[PDB]
Design an enzyme around this catalytic site. Structure first.
Site, mmCIF file in Angstrom:
data_model
loop_
_atom_site.group_PDB
_atom_site.id
_atom_site.type_symbol
_atom_site.label_atom_id
_atom_site.label_comp_id
_atom_site.label_asym_id
_atom_site.label_seq_id
_atom_site.Cartn_x
_atom_site.Cartn_y
_atom_site.Cartn_z
ATOM 1 N N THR A 50 0.933 -1.346 -0.030
ATOM 2 C CA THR A 50 0.042 -0.175 -0.027
ATOM 3 C C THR A 50 0.725 1.254 -0.085
ATOM 4 O O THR A 50 1.636 1.480 0.989
ATOM 5 C CB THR A 50 -0.897 0.014 0.920
ATOM 6 O OG1 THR A 50 -1.896 -1.163 1.172
ATOM 7 C CG2 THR A 50 -1.660 1.462 1.248
ATOM 8 N N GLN A 51 0.875 2.110 -1.073
ATOM 9 C CA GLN A 51 1.680 3.388 -1.292
ATOM 10 C C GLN A 51 0.902 4.580 -0.450
ATOM 11 O O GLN A 51 1.453 5.418 0.035
ATOM 12 C CB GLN A 51 1.948 3.822 -2.435
ATOM 13 C CG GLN A 51 2.716 2.547 -3.359
ATOM 14 C CD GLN A 51 4.224 2.283 -2.749
ATOM 15 O OE1 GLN A 51 4.325 1.531 -1.892
ATOM 16 N NE2 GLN A 51 4.964 3.377 -2.684
ATOM 17 N N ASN A 52 -0.428 4.293 -0.635
ATOM 18 C CA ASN A 52 -1.211 5.507 -0.124
ATOM 19 C C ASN A 52 -2.295 5.071 0.974
ATOM 20 O O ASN A 52 -3.184 4.514 0.519
ATOM 21 C CB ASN A 52 -2.049 6.239 -1.147
ATOM 22 C CG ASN A 52 -0.782 6.707 -2.145
ATOM 23 O OD1 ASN A 52 0.022 7.531 -1.745
ATOM 24 N ND2 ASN A 52 -1.116 6.914 -3.477
ATOM 25 N N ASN A 101 5.799 -3.487 -1.618
ATOM 26 C CA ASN A 101 4.627 -3.301 -1.268
ATOM 27 C C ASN A 101 4.247 -3.494 -0.075
ATOM 28 O O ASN A 101 4.003 -4.368 0.588
ATOM 29 C CB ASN A 101 3.593 -4.205 -2.068
ATOM 30 C CG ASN A 101 2.321 -3.930 -2.171
ATOM 31 O OD1 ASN A 101 1.777 -2.691 -1.687
ATOM 32 N ND2 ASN A 101 1.402 -4.488 -2.770
ATOM 33 N N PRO A 102 4.213 -2.296 0.769
ATOM 34 C CA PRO A 102 3.991 -2.499 2.518
ATOM 35 C C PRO A 102 2.715 -2.596 2.551
ATOM 36 O O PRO A 102 1.756 -2.307 1.703
ATOM 37 C CB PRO A 102 4.480 -0.989 2.844
ATOM 38 C CG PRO A 102 4.343 0.098 1.771
ATOM 39 C CD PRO A 102 4.585 -1.015 0.412
#
Lengths: 201, 239, 238, 248, 230, 199, 215, 228, 213
Positions: free
Chosen positions: G1-3, G104-105
């Site tokens: 999750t980037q955002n 991809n966190p």
């Protein structure tokens, strides 16, 4: 970082510094950049530590596989050749390796020079590193094919003395091996301060 | 236990299909080959022209590298696959290493690929036996033979096809050390083996030589007719 | 007989006898006896020789610090499920960072051997695993089979003529849970001596013993801590 | 329990599908390529010559494959169409590769490898088709080759078809011409070949086929020749039969 | 991962299961097709087994393009599959060239695919012979394939049952030059030659390939012309 | 970058390269060779990315030798050049493109000699003379002044001497040592290294 | 999750004598808008441990689903064995490390409290996989705000009671309600003991505003 | 019938691995002896032709500088295990700066001793004798195509290995010395063979702690032949 | 966007003694302007002749440590024997090279005895080069510690100073003095000290506290 190697009448002269820093900080002064490949082959660490360490270990691996399969000592052109074949696979992928390849051939002395950019050549005199052009100054000054053993010892020893003298990135110990017909021979490993008390006067 | 699948063994552990692959090899045309000290020399027999075709396409002797010389046994087209395969292989070894490609390496390739090719499933093995002449390492003359099992093997002289033990026994009755380093006596040795062919027809003999630095030199059936002339003349000297 | 060939083919009695053939291969193995106390699990195997100069092949091997097994039957499949065994040890030992409960692991072994007991193109495995493990609730002795029906017990024995030792397990299973580690061990060789033809005695080099405890790591011995276990013995009542 | 041989030797050591495939080859029509230096020809035999057809195909055994090369055929028809489309794919790919036509020999051996892979491995029914090869090159000029199901091939000047053509090949050895490139004498000789060996009474043109391949200045044109000159070849060859019966 | 097709050569050289598929086509439903001077007329013999049956469900004369019609002698359920394949193939020609595919190219491509089914494994070949026709570029054409991948080009032919008998009858009554309604005339003649007696609008089904385009005919005009067509 | 020349004569091809393998500060190697004997009548010259030059010379050189041993005879230089440019066009739209700059020099028994000149963008060309670098600019201007279609090989030699002497005049780099071949009906013949005393 | 779209806020967690108490609010602010002022930010694992978390609440739903599935798995084994909270910290550490290792966190900040075998447990889990143990955890700003109060009381006295630590958490949550812009006057206090996992209701704070009359 | 790779015997195992252990016996014999002074080894070449060059046939090959080998049966399959085993030891030096221990080498080969697979090729028929000197001094090893590896004190293989191992058990004890085991070994060799014992029939393989290198004797082999 | 690397701190000291190897490291764990804990020891007794120190990225430290222990189990349960220290340096070097293009933001020093029972200190770089040395200080206080280690251990730049071999407890005084003096100036250092001593009879541990700010 400054290394050099040049073949002559009686085998090949192998010389190096031992200084490896980390930017403006000295990491070590005792770095044996001349990676001993075989009793009959020697290579250099010229740019890249795991590149020369790994890939020259993989090359010594592959030459050992060659000698086991064919019962036969490899040629230095074959070793530098397949070395270039292995390095070429990662072209442009951010790998520094500009090593010198030294040994003995059935055709005589074996001297090759391989870079990460596919700059595999042969030749007679080579010097790699930051203060390499220093060693082209003093070495290309004092070079002759018919020099003797101790003559080339004080020649290349003087050469590392000058190159490490003006270079802030070169120093430590003066590594010095001597490729012969049968196989190489360790000469000495000398301090630049000892060559400064010796060579200053 | 049966003479079917290349995988199973006999109750005493045998591979009958390898043995059957040796059969068409033994029922193949005859070819001989010796090494000179400098001028290695060979020749197939039984040309057998049939009045209505060309015979440059049926040439059974070629080269992978210029230092090496090709022959085979058994059938033709599988050996064509092995030959073009080893042109790719010798040329690839040439591309990788700038050495002259060695007979020991390429015979390890051919015998190895024939071996694992025999190991793999549903694949009809090569019913051939190659004869490989190379004088490379300072022109050191070498000749190898292969096997339908895929075992590369060096000899000093060689003869294959029908009557290979007969002409081989002639070479046992002909193995002089002086036949080499008197390469003209090696020529008389090749004319002695082609003279000791199972038919010895004189026109069905095809010979090729190499002086370990030259190319593959194809002879003529008039020089060879002079070799049968000096062969019958030397037989008259024995008379 | 024409049906008794494969794994997929049901018998006209529904009994796929190739499984029974694998059982017969398991019966070809040497004798070994596994057991446990309430706290301490000890399993002993029978070594045999190929010749006089040939070393005696073991059946007990270490797996985990709390897991020890024996084996009877095949060897390459035994090392196969040994590498899969230690593999599954280091799987949850890495990820979950805990030692393994035994029943989930051996259930994964039965599901592991499910497919080679199920499909065409696959043979069963000749397997004789006697299993000593330590979860939170202490020792557990399992046994395996090529039918993949693993059995928990207090003590079992498999191999040649092991039924006499099984009767020893019946007539001393009350004794096994209460007595300690040394005399429990000599009960163990007082099962292996009934797995023996009586004309020869249980010597040193033909036997080895693995011992695991709730506070003891699984350790195997050969002649050296076994010679203090080979003392304190009586002869056979001839 | 449902395996044929398809990749295995007969017991002693011979072959099975190859021999039976050649037995399928012998029961077919007859073609020939003759000796010619200034071009080359092909005679052929029409099969299934029933009258209610259309015959608007203009090429039944003949396959003009790339520009200066054609092939008569003998065997399974649509299998052969697979092999001709694949063949034009191969040599057309060579023409893509060099923008130069094939030397034809590596094409012939290539298709021999195509059938040959089916002989060794992947035990199916192989192609029971033998077929001709005519062409021209800069290295040997006009050429003649013979496909084999065994992966073998022939660089011929007088070819061979099966059961209808063994007597034809004996007529080629006993009546072998040499030195003359005369296409019309090769047409009278081939009219003798199909006259005896083709059992069609008086050599009907609707049972036969002839097409040649000559050199034209860089084009090496292919004369798929029509029927009226075949008719005067019939009347001419029967005039040669009249010359044959002058001795009576 | 099976399949070495199925097929080996006989000691004669013949292909026995393919011959059995030809026996299945010989036991197939009779039909006939006639290339006239203007178009090609296809006519099938389609009798229902029960009087309860609907004929509006199954249809025999089948176009592939609006100038291309086709019938068969074999089985319907395979016929739908290979017809669907020819539909997809013809759409692929129209995608590449944006042009209606010529019937010769249909027979080359589709017959090559059926030859792949002969040299195709896993199951059986498709025991269906095909009658393909189209009025492509002025001339109508009439092409007959087989289960073994081969084909021909007929003026008029028949397949199914008594196909040699109606083949001799079309050989007798038929000539080179007819018209469309003349081909329907001798097509009904050769249809009643081998067919049953009770022949109505539903016992047969007829299509034509006009140069103006394919026209699958209906039991209306079949009931009109075939109202004592001679 | 540095130099090539491929001067076409009526029956000869006169080619010349350098022997320099400098690296960005100094001249590392002063006896380099780029003249690549493809066959007995076909020659290769190249200036490009030094890894891609060597590996490309391996694949193309040994691949031509694979044609020579396989079919047993020599390619045409035209369709051979078409094969090389074909391989460049394969290499272009790829994750690993090469940046090499080729020129070829073949000879035919029928068409006589032939000159082909490639690009790093896979361009076929048939020229009387072609080059690389900025010596391409200077030398094609000079040879454009002195081109003759029917010119002798000795006028090509001394004209090459003159044009190289003007190359010593207003060029920024050193470039001392230039290797030269010549093609004839026989094939490849080496002319000597061409170096000049400046002062 | 980037955002990360919907995020939580600081979570408080601290051991005590015979258990671990962990409290957090009930606020699901989307940006500066408190869009969801009624959520639950704590998953009650069965009997030994319990999860508090910050970051993406959709990720909290996801790891709630996966972890709850795994607990259902070993419970339905019926072997008499469960997951240790240290093993939850282990698998969650490997899961987040392999998660970020693919670049991809999962935007989370997780805290595991497990009282089991008489032993309190409080393991931190980072989004970056940096993970450790501590007697007192304070995520978000509360690392900058209430963590010196935590270390203040722990250096003042090592052992505590549930009432001492509980009212301590009440004061700290009150402070976070004074100066946290992502705070809200509704929180839940939870506690794992040997009596089990306990969730309390929507508790609130008691502010002071006497200084507003000053200038 | 003749249930191959996927059917056990109704009592025991594979009728095909039984055919492989059966297929060992046709090979020539070889006798290695672990002396504490150093493992020696010998093999019968069984040379047929006068043209048959003696050094062309190899039985002892050098895996590592202190590791020789010995085969029994299928030649190029064994040599495949030779080259791959040398790769594996080279991996152990490559990643460990040290020689792979010879037993772990034998376990590395012994993994795929039975990993024959025609699905998911054929099993091999060659038995192996391994001579090495590890950190525990000299080592003599014997494995089989069935992968049941055992360390052996002195092992005979191939043809006539019954009487060779029997007479070996007669002549063997623990405190044997090197040249004792050499001349006694070739005594057993010229017992079990049929040809006249000359330099062509046999070859030696001598590893020692001080002589880790050179598992061979070169034409003083002839001298030890005339020592008996 | 997501940055994968972060600096977790660390300060490692290893001395290859005559028959010992002393590896001490602070246990203070910090990030940015926040202490995470004061107890995070970087010293790990892998075998009885090997203790490893790992600074830099913490998840790569724990991850890589568990991988090391797993491969210890692979080597021994494959081979019935423990690794030598240089084999661990080699295998670790193949690991750090095996993640060449995504490196570990991690510094590494391996201490432990050789087969002669003498200390063997192997420094590392985050790509995987190494050598056997006598003494290394990794982490933030490397420039803080190495010149005094040259003054005392190496006796460098010292006129008329003989080379007495440093004893064990004298080296302990050295360790406590350099961690006090480094602790007075590093913000990444303090609150404790994990001391490990690799002897020929076991490994001794000793935690000596530091200042608490």
């Amino acid at each position: 970082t400054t290394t050099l190697a040049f073949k002559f009448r009686h085998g090949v002269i192998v010389a190096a510094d031992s200084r490896a820093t980390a930017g403006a900080y000295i990491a070590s002064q005792t770095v044996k950049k001349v990676i001993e490949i075989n009793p009959y082959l020697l290579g250099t660490m010229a740019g890249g530590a795991a590149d020369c360490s790994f890939w020259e270990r993989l090359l010594a691996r592959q030459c050992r596989i060659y000698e086991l399969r064919n019962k036969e000592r490899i040629s230095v052109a074959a070793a530098s050749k397949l070395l270039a074949n292995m390095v070429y696979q990662y072209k442009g992928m951010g790998l520094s390796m500009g090593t010198m390849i030294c040994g003995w051939d059935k055709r005589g002395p074996g001297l090759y020079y391989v870079d990460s950019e596919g700059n595999r050549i042969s030749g007679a005199t080579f010097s790699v590193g930051s203060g390499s052009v220093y060693a082209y100054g003093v070495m290309d000054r004092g070079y002759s094919y018919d020099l003797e053993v101790e003559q080339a010892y004080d020649l290349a020893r003087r050469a590392i003395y000058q190159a490490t003298y003006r270079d802030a990135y070169s120093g430590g110990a003066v590594n010095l091996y001597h490729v012969r017909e049968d196989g190489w021979i360790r000469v000495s490993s000398d301090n630049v301060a000892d060559l400064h008390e010796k060579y200053s006067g | 236990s049966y003479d079917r699948a290349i995988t199973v063994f006999s109750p005493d552990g045998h591979l009958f299909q390898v043995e059957y692959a040796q059969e068409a090899v033994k029922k193949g045309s005859t070819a001989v080959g010796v090494r000179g000290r400098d001028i290695v020399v060979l020749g197939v027999e039984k040309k057998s022209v049939a009045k209505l075709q060309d015979e440059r396409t049926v040439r059974k002797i070629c080269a992978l590298d210029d230092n090496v010389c090709m022959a085979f046994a058994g059938l033709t087209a599988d050996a064509r696959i092995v030959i073009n395969r080893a042109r790719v292989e010798c040329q690839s070894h040439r591309l990788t290493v700038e050495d002259p490609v060695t007979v020991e390496y390429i015979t390890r390739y051919i015998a190895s690929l024939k071996q694992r090719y025999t190991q793999s499933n549903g694949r009809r093995p090569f019913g051939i036996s190659a004869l490989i002449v190379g004088f490379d390492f300072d022109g050191t003359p070498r000749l190898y033979q292969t096997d339908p099992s895929g075992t590369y093997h060096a000899w000093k002289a060689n003869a294959i096809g029908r009557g290979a033990k007969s002409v081989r026994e002639f070479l046992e009755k002909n193995y002089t050390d002086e036949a080499i380093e008197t390469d003209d006596l090696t020529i008389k040795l090749v004319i002695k083996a082609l003279l000791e062919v199972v038919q010895s027809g004189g026109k069905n003999i095809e010979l090729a030589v190499m002086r370990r630095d030259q190319s593959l030199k194809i002879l003529n059936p008039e020089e060879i007719e002079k070799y049968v002339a000096e062969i019958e003349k030397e037989k008259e000297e024995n008379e | 007989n024409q049906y008794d060939n494969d794994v997929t083919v049901w018998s006209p009695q529904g009994r796929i006898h190739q499984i029974e053939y694998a059982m017969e291969a398991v019966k070809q193995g040497s004798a070994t006896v596994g057991l446990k106390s309430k706290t301490h699990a000890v399993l002993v195997a029978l070594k045999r020789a190929q010749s006089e100069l040939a070393a005696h092949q073991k059946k007990i091997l270490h797996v985990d610090n709390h897991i020890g097994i024996s084996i009877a039957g095949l060897t390459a499949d035994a090392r196969l499920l040994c590498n899969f065994m230690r593999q599954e040890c280091l799987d949850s030992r890495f990820v979950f960072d805990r030692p393994l409960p035994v029943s989930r692991l051996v259930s994964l072994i039965g599901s592991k051997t499910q497919i080679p007991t199920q499909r065409y193109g696959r043979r069963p495995y000749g397997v004789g695993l006697l299993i000593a493990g330590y979860d939170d609730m202490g020792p557990h002795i399992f046994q395996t089979c090529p039918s993949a029906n693993y059995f928990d017990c207090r003590a079992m024995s498999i191999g040649a003529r092991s039924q006499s030792a099984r009767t020893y397990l019946e007539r001393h299973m009350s004794e096994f849970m209460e007595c300690n580690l040394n005399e429990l061990v000599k009960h163990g060789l007082r099962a292996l001596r009934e797995t023996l033809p009586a004309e020869q005695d249980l010597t040193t080099k033909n036997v080895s013993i693995g011992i695991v405890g709730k506070d003891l790591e699984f350790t195997i011995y050969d002649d050296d801590d076994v010679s203090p276990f080979l003392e304190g013995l009586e002869e056979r009542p001839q | 329990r449902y395996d044929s041989r398809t990749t295995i030797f007969s017991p002693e050591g011979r072959l099975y599908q190859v021999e039976y495939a050649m037995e399928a080859i012998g029961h077919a029509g007859t073609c020939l390529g003759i000796l010619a230096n200034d071009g080359v020809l092909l005679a052929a035999e029409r099969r299934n010559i029933h009258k209610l057809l259309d015959e608007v195909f203009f090429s039944e055994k003949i396959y003009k494959l790339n520009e200066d090369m054609a092939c008569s055929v003998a065997g399974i028809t649509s299998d052969a169409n697979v092999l001709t489309n694949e063949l034009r794919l191969i040599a057309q790919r060579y023409l893509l590769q060099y923008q130069e036509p094939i030397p034809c020999e590596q094409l012939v051996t290539a298709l021999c490898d195509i059938k040959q892979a089916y002989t060794q491995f992947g035990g199916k029914r192989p192609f029971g088709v033998s077929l001709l090869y005519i062409g021209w090159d800069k290295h040997y000029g006009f050429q003649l080759y013979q496909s084999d199901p065994s992966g073998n091939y022939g660089g011929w000047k007088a070819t061979c078809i099966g059961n209808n053509s063994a007597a034809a090949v004996s007529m080629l050895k006993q009546d072998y011409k040499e030195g003359e490139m005369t296409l019309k004498s090769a047409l009278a000789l081939a009219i003798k070949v199909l006259n005896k060996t083709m059992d069609v009474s008086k050599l009907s043109a609707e049972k036969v086929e002839i097409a040649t391949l000559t050199r034209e200045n860089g084009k090496t044109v292919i004369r798929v020749l029509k029927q009226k000159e075949v008719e005067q070849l019939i009347k001419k060859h029967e005039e040669e039969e009249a010359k044959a019966e002058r001795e009576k | 991962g099976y399949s070495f097709s199925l097929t080996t050569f006989s000691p004669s050289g013949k292909l026995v299961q393919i011959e059995y598929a030809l026996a299945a086509v010989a036991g197939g439903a009779p039909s006939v097709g006639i290339k006239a001077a203007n178009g090609v007329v296809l006519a099938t013999e389609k009798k229902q087994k029960s009087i309860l049956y609907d004929e509006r469900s199954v249809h025999k004369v089948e176009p592939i393009t609006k100038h291309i019609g086709l019938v068969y002698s074999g089985m319907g359920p395979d016929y739908r599959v290979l017809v669907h394949r020819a539909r997809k193939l013809a759409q692929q020609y129209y995608l590449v060239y944006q042009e209606p595919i010529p019937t010769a190219q249909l027979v080359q491509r589709v017959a090559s695919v059926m030859q792949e089914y002969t040299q195709s494994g896993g199951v059986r070949p498709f025991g269906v012979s095909l009658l393909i026709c189209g009025w492509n570029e002025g001339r109508p054409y009439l092409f007959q394939s087989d289960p073994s991948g081969a084909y021909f080009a007929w003026k008029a032919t028949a397949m199914g049952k008594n196909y040699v008998n109606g083949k001799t009858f079309l050989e007798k009554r038929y000539n080179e030059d007819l018209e469309l309604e003349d081909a329907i005339h001798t097509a009904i003649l050769t249809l009643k030659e081998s067919f049953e007696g009770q022949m109505t609008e539903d016992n047969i089904e007829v299509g034509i390939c006009n140069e103006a385009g394919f026209r699958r005919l209906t039991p209306t005009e079949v009931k009109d012309y075939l109202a004592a067509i001679a | 970058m540095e130099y090539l020349i491929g001067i076409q004569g009526p029956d000869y091809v006169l080619v010349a390269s350098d022997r320099v393998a400098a690296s960005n500060i100094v001249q590392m190697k002063d006896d380099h060779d780029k003249m690549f004997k493809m066959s007995e009548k076909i020659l290769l010259l190249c200036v490009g990315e030094a890894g891609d030059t060597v590996q490309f010379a391996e694949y193309i050189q040994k691949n031509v030798q694979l044609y020579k041993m396989r079919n047993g005879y020599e390619l045409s230089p035209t369709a051979a050049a078409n094969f090389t440019r074909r391989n460049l066009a394969d290499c272009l739209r790829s994750r690993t493109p090469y940046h090499v700059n080729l020129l070829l020099a073949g000879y035919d028994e029928h068409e006589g000699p032939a000159l082909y000149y490639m690009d790093y963008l896979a361009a076929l060309a048939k020229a009387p003379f072609a080059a690389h670098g900025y010596g391409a600019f200077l030398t094609l201007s000079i040879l454009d002044r002195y081109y003759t279609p029917t010119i002798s090989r000795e006028r090509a030699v001394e004209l090459l001497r003159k044009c190289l002497e003007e190359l010593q005049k207003r060029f920024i780099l050193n470039l001392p040592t230039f290797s030269v071949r010549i093609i004839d009906k026989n094939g490849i013949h080496d002319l000597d290294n061409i170096s000049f005393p400046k002062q | 999750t980037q955002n990360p779209m919907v995020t939580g806020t600081s979570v408080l967690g601290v051991k005590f004598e015979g258990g671990v108490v962990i409290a957090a609010d009930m606020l699901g602010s989307y940006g500066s808008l408190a869009r969801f002022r009624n959520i639950s930010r704590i998953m009650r694992v069965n009997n030994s441990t319990m999860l508090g978390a910050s970051g993406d609440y959709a990720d909290f739903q996801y790891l709630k689903q996966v972890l709850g599935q795994m607990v259902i798995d070993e419970e339905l084994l019926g072997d008499g064995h469960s997951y240790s909270p240290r093993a939850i910290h282990s698998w969650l550490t490997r899961a987040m490390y392999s998660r970020r290792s693919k670049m991809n966190p999962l935007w989370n900040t997780m805290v595991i409290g497990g009282y089991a075998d008489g032993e309190s447990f409080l393991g931190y889990v980072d989004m970056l996989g940096v993970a450790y143990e501590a007697p007192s955890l304070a995520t978000g700003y509360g690392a900058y705000l209430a963590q010196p109060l935590l270390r203040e009381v722990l250096e003042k006295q090592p052992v505590l009671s549930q009432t001492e630590a509980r009212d301590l958490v009440e004061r700290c949550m009150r402070v976070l309600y004074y100066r946290d812009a992502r705070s809200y006057n509704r929180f839940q206090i939870a506690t794992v003991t040997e009596k089990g996992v306990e969730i309390e209701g929507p508790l609130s704070t008691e502010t002071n505003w006497d200084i507003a009359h000053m200038i | 019938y003749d249930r191959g790779v996927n059917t056990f015997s109704p009592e025991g195992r594979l009728f095909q691995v039984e055919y492989a252990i059966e297929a060992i016996k046709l090979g020539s014999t070889a006798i290695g002896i672990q002396t504490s002074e150093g493992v020696c080894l010998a093999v019968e070449k069984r040379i047929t032709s006068p043209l048959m060059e003696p050094s062309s046939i190899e039985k002892i090959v050098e895996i590592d500088a202190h590791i020789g080998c010995a085969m029994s049966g299928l030649i190029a399959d064994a040599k495949t295990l030779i080259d791959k085993a040398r790769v594996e030891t080279q991996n152990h030096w490559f990643t460990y700066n040290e020689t792979m221990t010879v037993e772990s080498v034998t376990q590395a080969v012994s993994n795929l001793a039975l990993q024959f697979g025609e699905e998911d090729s054929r099993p091999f028929g060659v038995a192996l004798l391994f001579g090495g000197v590890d950190e525990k001094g000299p080592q003599l090893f014997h494995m089989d195509p069935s992968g049941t590896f055992v360390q052996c004190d002195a092992r005979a293989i191939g043809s006539a290995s019954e009487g060779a191992q029997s007479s070996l058990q007669e002549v063997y004890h623990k405190s044997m010395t090197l040249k004792e085991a050499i001349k006694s070994s070739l005594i057993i060799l010229k017992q079990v063979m049929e040809e006249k014992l000359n330099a062509t029939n046999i070859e030696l393989a001598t590893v020692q702690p001080g002589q880790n290198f050179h598992m061979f004797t070169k034409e003083e082999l002839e001298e030890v032949i005339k020592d008996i | 966007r997501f940055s994968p690397y972060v600096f977790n701190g660390g300060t490692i000291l290893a001395i290859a003694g005559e028959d010992f190897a002393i590896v001490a490291s602070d246990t203070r764990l910090s990030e940015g302007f926040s202490i995470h804990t004061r107890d995070s020891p970087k010293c790990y007794k892998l075998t009885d002749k090997t203790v490893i120190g790992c600074s830099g990225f913490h998840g790569d430290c724990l991850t890589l440590t568990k991988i090391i222990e797993a491969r210890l189990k692979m080597y021994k349960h494959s081979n019935n024997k423990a690794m030598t220290t240089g084999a661990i340096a080699a295998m670790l070097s193949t690991i750090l090279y095996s993640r060449r293009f995504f490196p570990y933001y991690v510094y590494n020093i391996i201490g432990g005895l050789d087969e002669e029972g003498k200390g063997a200190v192997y420094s590392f770089d985050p790509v995987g080069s190494y050598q056997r040395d006598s003494f290394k200080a990794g982490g933030s206080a490397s420039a803080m510690l190495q010149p005094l280690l040259d003054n005392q251990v190496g006796f460098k730049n010292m006129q008329n100073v003989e080379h007495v071999p440093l004893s064990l407890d004298r080296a302990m005084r050295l360790v406590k003095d350099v961690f006090i003096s480094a602790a007075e100036r590093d913000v990444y250092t303090g609150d404790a000290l994990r001391i490990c001593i690799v002897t020929k009879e076991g490994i001794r541990e000793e935690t000596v506290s530091l200042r608490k700010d």
